Write a protein that binds this ligand. Structure first.
Ligand SMILES: CCCCCCCC/C=C\CCCCCCCCCCCCCC(=O)N[C@@H](CO[C@@H]1O[C@H](CO)[C@H](O)[C@H](OS(=O)(=O)O)[C@H]1O)[C@H](O)/C=C/CCCCCCCCCCCCC
Ligand SMILES: CCCCCCCC/C=C\CCCCCCCCCCCCCC(=O)N[C@@H](CO[C@@H]1O[C@H](CO)[C@H](O)[C@H](OS(=O)(=O)O)[C@H]1O)[C@H](O)/C=C/CCCCCCCCCCCCC
Lengths: 201, 201
């Protein structure tokens, strides 16, 4: 999965990229081609970070190094540049997933619609993405929501082949431990480096 | 641009991929981040074709060869596989662009809205894509439309740096000659090979 955090909280770029490279395929298990463009955008972020990393894996050994090195490389253009920008967006997608999954695991629901996950996706959107989206992108989110899988198929997909919903949620809870810790460190690094931007798309 | 067609109408894969690789950047000149996911999906098609080509450029020398070789490789799974599938979708995006640009050049408009290009995009959608889109994707198209550039900025973008609208449209008309011929050959090849599918997303 995601390997745990070292004591010094430095996140190794290579292993992080191998971990997150498992993410784009998981989109196809939301069970709708509607999500293909979102898959492609997240893949694009990962590809951009990988392209920078590959130029000098020692110089870009950790995610912290990416921000440090690029700040120096790009001056006034930073942080709206390079792998710093790609990771700024990637982390927002990762945080959306974190909040979404955590919300489902925490029993958050619409009483009247137990085999949907609309309410969980809406909370994740508000906490991770909405701040950076203008009116048009928000309308697109609303449209995409109609394509969201049934809770059961979604859980069946995350386990595909037969486990109970309860067993699946326990597996998701276990995954969430290192996943949340890793995302938290990435957000902290953007904050501490003043690398976070607040422009809307 | 696109190089002209040889007498035997065989389209060389390598040069075709270099030509179409100029396409994803042009999306950014629609002047709205709303189109970034569409850019990424088209880039994905091109990357998939390139990945197949790179395995054996002689075996995949022409687009016709891709379909011929893959039909043999994949049997009952073909044509819903490999570079054949990627090109099936790419050609639909290319045809959308063709019809869109041709519609603008042909003076097609909404009298009441001369600095918009909504009517031209809608015609392109109906002729190239709509057949393969279910209700949700169609609603997404409708949302994306709100982000379409002004006709003037769009034309300014295609020329960026100062030329009249009239000069820009003449340049687009010239481009459309080899572009349309090439797309026509690709559609003909899918038709003649019975490689075209009609499933909806
Ligand atoms: C390690 C991961 C763990 C894997 C295991 C997890 C298992 C979970 C199972 C399934 C996964 C669940 C899927 C849930 C849905 C995924 C989350 C949606 C994430 C959307 C992220 C949108 C980001 C965004 O707004 N992008 C925007 C900005 O893009 C960036 O723009 C920059 C310039 O300003 C740069 O050009 C940048 O490019 S780069 O070269 O610098 O990198 C580029 O990426 C882009 O313009 C807009 C895209 C359309 C907005 C997206 C609409 C949100 C809809 C998402 C649907 C959620 C509903 C799902 C229902 C369950
Ligand atoms: C050589 C080119 C010439 C360059 C110069 C041209 C200059 C022109 C200037 C600017 C460009 C103009 C831009 C106009 C807009 C671009 C056209 C929009 C094209 C949309 C194409 C959508 C295709 C589509 O529906 N895709 C769908 C199917 O994807 C395929 O699914 C397959 C499985 O069934 C495979 O997974 C496949 O992957 S692969 O690995 O096998 O490749 C994958 O690609 C995908 O699920 C759905 C995506 C969302 C639908 C797209 C919504 C349409 C909105 C487009 C906006 C048009 C409005 C623009 C206003 C001007």
């Amino acid at each position: 999965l995601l390997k745990p955090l070292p004591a010094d909280k430095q996140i190794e770029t290579g292993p992080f990229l191998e971990a997150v490279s498992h993410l784009p395929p998981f989109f196809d298990c939301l069970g709708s081609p509607v999500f293909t463009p979102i898959k492609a955008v997240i893949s694009g972020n990962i590809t951009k970070i990988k392209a920078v990393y590959d130029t000098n894996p020692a110089k870009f050994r950790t995610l912290q190094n990416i921000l440090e090195v690029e700040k120096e490389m790009y001056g006034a253009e930073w942080p709206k540049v390079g792998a710093t920008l790609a990771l700024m967006w990637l982390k927002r997608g990762l945080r959306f997933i974190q909040v979404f999954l955590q919300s489902i695991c925490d029993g958050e629901r619409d009483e009247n619609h137990p085999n949907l996950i609309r309410v969980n996706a809406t909370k994740a959107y508000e906490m991770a993405l909405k701040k950076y989206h203008g009116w048009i992108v928000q309308k697109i989110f609303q449209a995409a929501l109609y394509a969201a899988p049934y809770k059961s198929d979604f859980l069946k997909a995350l386990s595909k082949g037969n486990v109970t919903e309860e067993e699946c949620l326990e597996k998701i809870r276990l995954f969430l431990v290192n996943y949340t810790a890793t995302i938290d460190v990435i957000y902290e690094m953007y904050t501490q480096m003043n690398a976070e931007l607040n422009y809307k798309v």
